[PDB]
Amino acid sequence: AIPIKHFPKHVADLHASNGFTEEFETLKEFTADSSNHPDNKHKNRYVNIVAYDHSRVKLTQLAGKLTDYINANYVDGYNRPKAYIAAQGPLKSTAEDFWRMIWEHNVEVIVMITNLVEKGRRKCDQYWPTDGSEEYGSFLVNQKNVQVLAYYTVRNFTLRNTKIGRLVTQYHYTQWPDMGVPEYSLPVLAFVRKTAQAKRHAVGPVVVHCSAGVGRTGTYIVLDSMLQQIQHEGTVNIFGFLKHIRSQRNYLVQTEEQYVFIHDTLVEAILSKETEVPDSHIHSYVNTLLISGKTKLEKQFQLLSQSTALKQCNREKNRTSSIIPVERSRVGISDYINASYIMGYYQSNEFIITQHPLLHTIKDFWRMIWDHNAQLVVMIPFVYWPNKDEPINCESFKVTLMSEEHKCLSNEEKLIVQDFILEATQDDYVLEVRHFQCPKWPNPDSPISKTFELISIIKEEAANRDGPMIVHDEHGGVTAGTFCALTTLMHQLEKENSMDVYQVAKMINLMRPGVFTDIEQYQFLYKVVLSLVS
Amino acid sequence: AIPIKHFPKHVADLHASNGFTEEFETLKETADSSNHPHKNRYVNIVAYDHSRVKTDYINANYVDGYNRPKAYIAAQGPLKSTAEDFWRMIWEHNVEVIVMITNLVEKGRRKCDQYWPTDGSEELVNQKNVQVLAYYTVRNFTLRNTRLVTQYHYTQWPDMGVPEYSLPVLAFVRKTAQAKRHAVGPVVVHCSAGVGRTGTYIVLDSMLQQIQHEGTVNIFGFLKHIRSQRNYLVQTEEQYVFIHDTLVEAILSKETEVPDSHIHSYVNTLLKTKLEKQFQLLSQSDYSTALKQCNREKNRTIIPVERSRVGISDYINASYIMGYYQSNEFIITQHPLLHTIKDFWRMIWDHNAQLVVMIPFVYWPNKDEPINCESFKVTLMSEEHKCLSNEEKLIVQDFILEATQDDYVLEVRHFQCPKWPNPDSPISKTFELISIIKEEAANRDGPMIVHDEHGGVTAGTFCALTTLMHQLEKENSMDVYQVAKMINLMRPGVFTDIEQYQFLYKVVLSLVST
C-alpha cells in the first residue's frame, strides 16, 4: 500500500521503469459449472467469458429445463464485502432475468459503462423503455425522469413485480471510447464521484455492467473503491485490491491500458481533491485558495498545465503556431481547419473554439458550421460574412444575410445580432445561424457582475438552437475559453447548485492547450463565479 | 413529346450539348394561408393556395399525374407539431399510400420527424407489418378516427445530390406503382422540404405510365405543368438530369422482373436477341475513378471503383455489393496477398462480418499460431468437412477475433468451396451450395465477404444467385437483368462475357421445378 503522499511519484516511476507491464503480466494467473451448462448457452454474450460459482449470482428457480442462471458475480469493495454485482450487458434473451436480478437482490443503483451500439456493433441490448413503460416478463419498468449530460446520463425508473413501486436509478457513462481508455481521466473521475455520492444512500448492492462485464466494469470497481480508501484511510492499493477481486470474477480490468489508466486517474484525484463546490461553500472555498508549500490557486493552476499536430504544409492556414488544435479535439471539415471541440455541461462537443478567419479560411469556417450543423456563433474581438449585396458561395451551400439588430447592454456596449441561412446547392436543407459580435469582453472597467449578462443572453439563445456553439476570439485562446468556461459554470450552478471551476478549466485546457497559460485568468474565473452567488 | 424510340438518343444529345442547364434555367420562371401567424420546415418553402390541401393548414399540395388529375399529394416531411395534421390529412383525403423519399436523420441533420410507431401503437396509428429491404422499407399501418395504410420508405437516397445508380430508384417506383394501381384515393408523397425528391418521384412515376400506355415521354412538358401546383418540384439540375437517365434505363430495360409462372416463357424469349440486348446494357452515364498510386502493389491484377470501394481504417481491393436485404449485403474482393492478409482480417473486423465464402494459399491461423493484428487476435476454433451430393468437400472453419484493447469477440465462419460451379456435375447441384450458405447467413449479422482469385465472375455469380434465391423465395419474382447490372456497376469487370450472364438465367430456370 502506498500513501496518497507518494502515489503520484510512485505512478510516474512505473511509467519510467515500464513497470506496469511486469505488474500486469504477474496478475494474469489464475470452476464455472453452472455457466457452462448447455441450458445456459444463449445467456452468455461470449463463450470465453464466465461467472465463477462461488461468486455467481443465483436467482430463484421457477417453471423441463433450468431457470436460476445469470452471467454476474458479487465482488467486494474496499473493506465492504459483496458490494457490487459485476455483470455482463443484458441480451434480449436475458433482459427479464436481469430485471429479476434487480428485484431479487434489492438493487437500486445500476452503473452502465457502455453504449448499446459502438461503431456498428451490438455491445448491449436496451433493457429499459425510452417510452413511458415496457414489460420484461413478470417485471414492469416505468421510466420517470431522464437527465442527459456531456459524459453520462441519469435515468430514474420504477419497478413492479407484476404478480402483486420501487425506485431504481441508472447511471450511464456514455462517452467511453470504442477501443482503449478515455483520453481524459478527469470526466470518468467525476462520474464515479457523482455515482459514489448517490450510491452512499442505497441499501442493496450496486449492479455494474459493460458489454462483457470484465474490463470496463472492473475498472469502475477499482476506481470507486480506491477512491473510498483515499477518503477514509489515506492510502491506495490497486494491485493488492485488484488481485483479490480477480478471484470473484475473471478478467476484471482486462487490458494493460485500463490498469495504467486507473493509476493516472487516481493520481489526478489525489492532487485535485474534491473541487466541486456547493452553493453554501463558494465563499469559504474561494478564499481558501489564496492564503503545503504554496496556495491552492497555484497548486490547482499547475494541474491545468498537463500530443500530435497536423501543421506541416497546411500550416499557412493558422494565425499563430501558439494556439493550434490537438488531434484528440481537432475539428474535422470534410479537409483541415484550426479548431478544437470543447466540452460543456450537456454535451462533449458543446462548443468549438477556433481562430478568426483568415481570408482563405473564410470558406472553411462556414463549411465547419455547415458540417457540424451549428446555429450559434459567438465572436469576441475583419468581416468574413455576406451582405445582401453579395451572398457567400460555397460549393455545397450558399451563405446569406437575413437580419441584423444592435442591442445596448446595461453599460451601453453593443451586441451585433445577425441572422443567416445556409441553403444547400445540392439538396433542400436550410441551416439557420445566429451571429453575435461582442464588445471588448470581459470589459474589466465595467464591473464583474455585468460579465455574466452577456453569457445569460447567449445561454437562452443556445437552448432553442441545436448543434454546437462556434466561439472565436482572435486566436481561439483565453477569451473564447473563459466564455465556454463561464457558460458551462452558469449551467452547472443553475442545475446542480455546484461549481467545479478546476475541472472546467482543465478539461478546456486539455482539449485546447494554451487557452489558460496564466493564473490571473484562472483566478478570474473564481472571481466572476462568486459574484453570481448573491 | 419524344417517343421512347428517340428518347434514349435525345437524352445523350442533352449530355453532349450541355442542354440540360438551358432546359432547367428556362424552367425557373400565391401563398396567403401558408404565410399566416410553426408548421413550415423552411421559410422559403410554401404551399400554393389553389393546390394546397385543407386549424385547416398543412404544407402540402395536390399535384396531377399523367392524364390523372389531383393524383398525388406532394407534401413536406412532418414535424412533431404537424404529425397529427398529417394523419388527419390521411383520414380526410382517403389516402392509403404514402411514399417517403428521405430518412429521419441524414449525416446528423433532422430531415423528417418520425410520425409513426416503432412499437405496437401511438396516437390512432397501430403498426401491423414491416419489411426492410436493401433500398426501401414497407410498413403496413392501420388507422382509426378516435382502415389499412401502407408506407413506402425509399431509404438509401444519398445525403446531397442524386443516387449514383438509377436502377434501384426505378424498381422502387415500379414496386410502389404496382401496389398503388388499385388504391382509390390520392397517394401522399414526401421528402424533407417536399420539393425536389418528392417532385422527382411524381415525374418518374407518371412518365413511366406514359411510356406504358402512350409510348411517349414528356418530362419538360409535364414538369412545367406541375410546377404550377407546387413550387421547386425537381429542385436541382442534377435531379432533372437524373430523371432522364433513369427513364432512359427503364425504356431500354422494359420490365425485367419475372414471376414464378412466366420464367419459362421469358427465358426462351431471350434467344439482336434480348440476351444480347440486355447483356449490352450491363456494360455501362456516371463516371469511374480507380486508385492506382504507389499502393498499386496491393492488387493482383479487377479493381474497385470509389462508389463501391471498401474502406478499412486504409486501402484494400474490395467493392461493396448489394443484395436483396441490404445495400452492402456482400463484399467482393481478391484472395489475400501475403501483405494484404492483415488488411483482409481488419476488413472483417471493421464491417463486423460473420461469413466468408471462398471459391477456387492459406491466409488463416492454425491452433499452432493465431494471427496477431494490432486491435485484435484471429484464432481457429473449429474445422468440419461436409460431403455434398456429388462427394465434394465444403471446408467449414469457425474463427474468433478478440479485441486486444477491448472485450469484444467476433465469431466468423469460413467456407472453402470446391470447383464452383462444377460444370461436370449438372446445373441442379450449383444451387445446393448457395442454399447451404443462405441459411447460415440468415442467423449471422454483418456483410458476406466473398472472394475468388480476383473478385471477378465466380464471386459475382455467387452474390447474384444468392440474391436471386432470396428474391424468388420471398417475392416469387426474379430480376436477373437488374441483379447482374447492379453487380457490374458496383464492380466493373465481373461480367464481361455473355455465357456467364446467360448462365444466370440457366441456373435460375432449373430452380423452378415442382
Question: What string of DSSP letters covers B100-166?
Answer: E-S-SEETTEE-----S-SSSEE--EEEEEEEE-SSEEEEEEEE----EEEEEEE----SSS--S-S
Method: X-ray
Tell me if residue A247 falls in helix, strand or coil. helix
Name residues whose C-beta falls within 8 Å of residue B26's C-beta, 6 or more positions apart in sequence. none
For residues A113 and A188, is the Cβ–Cβ distance under 8 A? no
Residue A30 preceded by cis peptide, ω within 30 = yes
Name residues whose C-beta falls within 8 Å of residue B337's C-beta, 6 or more positions apart in sequence. B298, B300
Distances (CA, A) of A359 to A316, A356, A387, B245: 12, 10, 16, 41
CB atoms closer than 10 angstroms to residue A401: 18
Pairing, β A152-161 against β A56-58? unpaired
Distance, CA of A290 to CA of A298 (rounded, Å): 8
CATH class of the A1-274 domain in this structure: alpha beta
CB atoms closer than 10 angstroms to residue A172: 22
Would you say A419 is a known binding-site residue? no
Residue B366 cell numbers, joined: 492454425
Residue A111 forms beta bridges with which residues?
Answer: A171, A208
Residue B97 forms beta bridges with which residues?
Answer: B150, B187
Question: Angle CA(A312)–CA(A317)–CA(A318) in degrees, nearest 5?
Answer: 90
Would you say A214 is a known binding-site residue? yes
DSSP per-residue string spanning A365-423 = HHHHHHHHT--EEEE-----S--SS--EEETTEEEEE---EEEE-TTS-EEEEEEEEEE
Report which of A78, A82, A102, A80 is spatially closest to residue A90, judged by C-alpha positions.
A102
Place of cell 428474391: B471
**Chain A residues touching B404 at Cβ < 8 A:** 255
Mutate to test the interface with A, among B381, B407, B409 (most CBs of A within 10 A): B407
Point out the residues of A that are catalytic: 210
In this complex, is the C-beta atom of A12 within 8 Å of any C-beta atom belonging to chain B?
Answer: no
**Long-range own/partner contacts, residues B275-282 (CB < 8 A, 24 or more apart):** B275/B498, B275/B501, B275/B502, B275/B505, B276/B498, B278/B253, B278/B481, B278/B501, B279/B498, B279/B501, B281/B249, B281/B252, B281/B253, B281/B481, B281/B485, B282/B481, B282/B484, B282/B485, B282/B488, B282/B495, B282/B501
In this complex, is the C-beta atom of B379 within 8 Å of any C-beta atom belonging to chain A?
Answer: no
Distances (CA, A) of B245 to A9, A161, A381, B202: 70, 61, 52, 16
**Chain A residues touching B405 at Cβ < 8 A:** 179-180, 255, 257
Place of cell 422499407: B137
Total count of residues recorded for chain A: 534
H or E segment to which residue A362 belongs: helix A362-372
For residues A345 and A495, is the Cβ–Cβ distance under 8 A? yes
In this complex, is the C-beta atom of A68 within 8 Å of any C-beta atom belonging to chain B?
Answer: no
Main-chain phi, psi angles of A409, to 5 degrees: -80, 170
Main-chain phi, psi angles of A13, to 5 degrees: -65, -30
Residue B358 corresponds to which amino acid?
A: M
Would you say A210 is a known binding-site residue? yes
In this complex, is the C-beta atom of A216 within 8 Å of any C-beta atom belonging to chain B?
Answer: yes
Place of cell 421547386: B232
Residue A33 cell numbers, joined: 459449472
Residue B70 cell numbers, joined: 389531383
CATH class of the B1-255 domain in this structure: alpha beta
**Chain B residues touching A121 at Cβ < 8 A:** 352, 408
Q: Exposed, middle or buried by CB within 10 Å (0-12, 13-18, 19+), for A321?
A: exposed
In this complex, is the C-beta atom of A210 within 8 Å of any C-beta atom belonging to chain B?
Answer: yes
- Spans of all domains in chain A: 1-274, 275-534
Report which of A444, A448, A423, A422 is spatially closest to residue A435, judged by C-alpha positions.
A422
The HSE-up count of residue A265 (CA atoms within 13 Å, CB side) is 27
Distances (CA, A) of A230 to A3, A77, A197, A223, A485: 8, 13, 15, 11, 29
Would you say B413 is a known binding-site residue? no
Assigned fold of A275-534: Protein-Tyrosine Phosphatase; Chain A (3.90.190)
The DSSP call for residue B334 is P
Would you say A178 is a known binding-site residue? yes
Distances (CA, A) of A169 to A109, A144, A201, A203, A304: 5, 10, 12, 13, 33
For residues B141 and B116, is the Cβ–Cβ distance under 8 A? yes
Q: Considering Cα of A133, then A136, then A137, then A138, what sign does the dihedral take?
A: negative
Distance, CA of A26 to CA of A246 (rounded, Å): 12
Residue A135 cell numbers, joined: 414489460
For residues B402 and B377, is the Cβ–Cβ distance under 8 A? yes
For residue B310, the Cα-to-chain-centroid distance in whole angstroms is 17
Tell me if residue B505 falls in helix, strand or coil. helix
Question: What sections of A84-185 are H helices per DSSP?
Answer: 95-104
DSSP per-residue string spanning B259-304 = ESTTHHHHHHHT---HHHHHHHHH----------GGGGGG------
Distance, CA of A107 to CA of B457 (rounded, Å): 58
CB atoms closer than 10 angstroms to residue A259: 24
Residue B486 corresponds to which amino acid?
A: M
Write the residue in A131, A212, A428 that is nearest to B193 by C-beta.
A428
H or E segment to which residue B474 belongs: helix B457-475
Domains B1-255 and B256-514 share a fold: yes
Residue A474 cell numbers, joined: 482572435
Residue A156 forms beta bridges with which residues?
Answer: A145, A169
H or E segment to which residue B3 belongs: strand B2-3
Distance from CA of B159 to the nearest CA of A (A): 8
Mutate to test the interface with A, among B42, B406, B445 (most CBs of A within 10 A): B406
For residues B196 and A428, is the Cβ–Cβ distance under 8 A? yes
Point out the residues of B that are catalytic: 191
Distance from CA of B45 to the nearest CA of A (A): 9
Distance from CA of B367 to the nearest CA of A (A): 16
Torsional class of B391: left (φ above 0), alpha (ψ -120 to 50), beta (otherwise): left
Distances (CA, A) of A456 to A186, A278, A318, A409, A443: 27, 21, 31, 12, 16
Distance, CA of B68 to CA of B206 (rounded, Å): 9
Exposed e or buried b for every residue in B137-170, given b needs 16+ CB within 10 A?
Answer: bbbebeeeeeeebbbbbbbbbeebbbbbbbbbbb
DSSP per-residue string spanning B41-77 = SSSS----TTTB------SEEEEEETTEEEEEEEEPP
Would you say A168 is a known binding-site residue? no
Distance in Å from the first CA to the final CA of chain B: 47
The HSE-up count of residue B402 (CA atoms within 13 Å, CB side) is 16
Distance, CA of A400 to CA of A391 (rounded, Å): 5
Distance, CA of B460 to CA of A46 (rounded, Å): 34
Distances (CA, A) of A460 to A463, A490, A528, B386: 5, 12, 19, 68
Distances (CA, A) of B199 to B67, B74, B165: 17, 7, 18
Tell me if residue B84 falls in helix, strand or coil. helix
For residues B96 and B149, is the Cβ–Cβ distance under 8 A? yes
Name residues whose C-beta falls within 8 Å of residue B375's C-beta, 6 or more positions apart in sequence. A179, B349, B403, B404, B405, B406
For residues A109 and A203, is the Cβ–Cβ distance under 8 A? no
Residue B71 cell numbers, joined: 393524383
Distances (CA, A) of B389 to B142, B429, B466: 48, 8, 19
For residue B422, the Cα-to-chain-centroid distance in whole angstroms is 31
Distance, CA of A274 to CA of A500 (rounded, Å): 9
**E strands present in B285-420:** 309-311, 315-321, 330-333, 355-358, 371-373, 376-380, 384-387, 393-403, 409-416
Distance, CA of B282 to CA of B351 (rounded, Å): 28
Minimum Cα–Cα distance from A48: chain B residue: B409
Distances (CA, A) of B112 to A169, B176, B191, B338, B381: 32, 21, 8, 48, 46
**Does the distance separating the beta carbons of A424 and B108 come in below 8 Å?**
no
Q: Considering Cα of B194, then B195, then B200, then B202, what sign does the dihedral take?
A: positive
Resolution, rounded to a tenth of an Å? 3.3
Distances (CA, A) of B192 to A467, B141, B196: 19, 21, 9
Distance from CA of A397 to the nearest CA of B (A): 10
The DSSP call for residue B309 is E
**Chain B residues touching A430 at Cβ < 8 A:** 42-44
Report which of A48, A49, A39, A38 is spatially closest to residue A72, judged by C-alpha positions.
A49
Distances (CA, A) of B24 to A204, B65, B208, B220, B498: 71, 20, 21, 9, 39
Residue B421 preceded by cis peptide, ω within 30 = yes
**Chain A residues touching B230 at Cβ < 8 A:** none
**Does the distance separating the beta carbons of B192 and A257 come in below 8 Å?**
no
Exposed e or buried b for every residue in B34-45, given b needs 16+ CB within 10 A?
Answer: beeeebbbbeeb
For residues A168 and A140, is the Cβ–Cβ distance under 8 A? no
H or E segment to which residue A157 belongs: strand A152-161
For residue B318, the Cα-to-chain-centroid distance in whole angstroms is 19
Residue B197 forms beta bridges with which residues?
Answer: none
Distance, CA of B499 to CA of B220 (rounded, Å): 40
Place of cell 452492402: B328
Q: Exposed, middle or buried by CB within 10 Å (0-12, 13-18, 19+), for A425?
A: middle
Rg over alpha carbons for chain B, rounded to the nearest Å, is 25
Total count of residues recorded for chain B: 514
Tell me if residue B26 falls in helix, strand or coil. helix
Distance in Å from the first CA to the final CA of chain A: 45
**Chain A residues touching B199 at Cβ < 8 A:** none
**Does the distance separating the beta carbons of A255 and B42 come in below 8 Å?**
no
The HSE-up count of residue B15 (CA atoms within 13 Å, CB side) is 14
Report which of B449, B428, B427 is spatially closest to residue B437, judged by C-alpha positions.
B449
In this complex, is the C-beta atom of A254 within 8 Å of any C-beta atom belonging to chain B?
Answer: yes
For residues A16 and A248, is the Cβ–Cβ distance under 8 A? no
For residues A253 and A219, is the Cβ–Cβ distance under 8 A? yes
The CATH architecture that domain B256-514 belongs to is Alpha-Beta Complex (3.90)
For residues A361 and A353, is the Cβ–Cβ distance under 8 A? no
* Three-state SS sequence of B90-113: HHHCCCCEEEECCCCEECCEECCC
